[PDB]
Amino acid sequence: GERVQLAHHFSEPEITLIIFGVMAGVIGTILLISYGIRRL
């Protein structure tokens, strides 16, 4: 980045991949729940 930044355990690509994976999991769970309804 720029100047001095606080060190983190997860790097920026790592943390953004983790966030995208969590978001994709939430989206998949919501889609599966919606697919469950309107059928039974």
Binding site: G1, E2, R3, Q5, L6, H8, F10, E12, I15, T16, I19, M23, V26, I27, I30, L31, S34, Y35
Partner: protein, 359 residues
Amino acid sequence: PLQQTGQLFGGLVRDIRRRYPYYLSDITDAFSPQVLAAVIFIYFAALSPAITFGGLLGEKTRNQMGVSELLISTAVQGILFALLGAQPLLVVGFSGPLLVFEEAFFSFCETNGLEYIVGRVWIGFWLILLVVLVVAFEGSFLVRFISRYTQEIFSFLISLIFIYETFSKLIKIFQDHPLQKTYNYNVLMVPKPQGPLPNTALLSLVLMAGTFFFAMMLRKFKNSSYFPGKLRRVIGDFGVPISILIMVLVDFFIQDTYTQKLSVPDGFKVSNSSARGWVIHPLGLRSEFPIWMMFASALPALLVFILIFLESQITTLIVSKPERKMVKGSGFHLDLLLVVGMGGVAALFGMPWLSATTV
């Protein structure tokens, strides 16, 4: 196009199958001077508000987001929306309500001692999830309930706001350089004049009036019965570039008098290097980001999504009316998804989110 199919992501696929077959025509139909004239028109009509909004945002947010970041975000989002969008006629850029929300969020973060740019990153992260959920359930079918009533009211209000701001900028210019009997001839000019200057406000008024008069006269000449028809249409299409060139040349030969010009950053760099870089860490730049704010950013993200959704969908309704002879179709779901996704991605890089501006 506003019907509810009942299938997951059905609206997106319908918009894709409606628009992408016309992709080959979308390149060949631009072989006309009217397209080039429209390019010249929209270049200024999008650059000048972008420069003004970037300057105001840099002043209000301590240059955390400024002119350069806004210009880069506008360029990237416009390129992606032109390459992949369903209604390329829409112009993607910053707007006033977005500036108000940015100021409010900056004030909130300053009061609570939170990193505002990381808060924007989390807001964009929530925006991506919100738009994916909306597109998945075909949430853009509710736009069919917006009749001509609301569309025309919004368009008239936005036009009145635009005209009022245009006149208020001239009023502010007149206030900065009032008409006085005497002036100080030794006034520093860098970066801006610190005192009133002679002939500034009057020349600005003259240039604005001349630009408006030439634009209106050339628009009338487009519909007039003078000159051969082909040359008449060529001149009428390039009426705005011709007026801009004429007034710029007129101001150019007046060397002594000072008029405010366009200001752009020297290079492609962040507005404030100390505050942030090109990539902003979602976990925090200077201090560790609080856990609670990551979940609390949804409500500001909800407000941003509501603003962008209403603006883009009403603009698409206005530009895709059947009376305007739109014979290619418009995709609401694809355009909304692309706009909000590009905003969320640009939030990660410390760039402002945009919307389909009406004007």
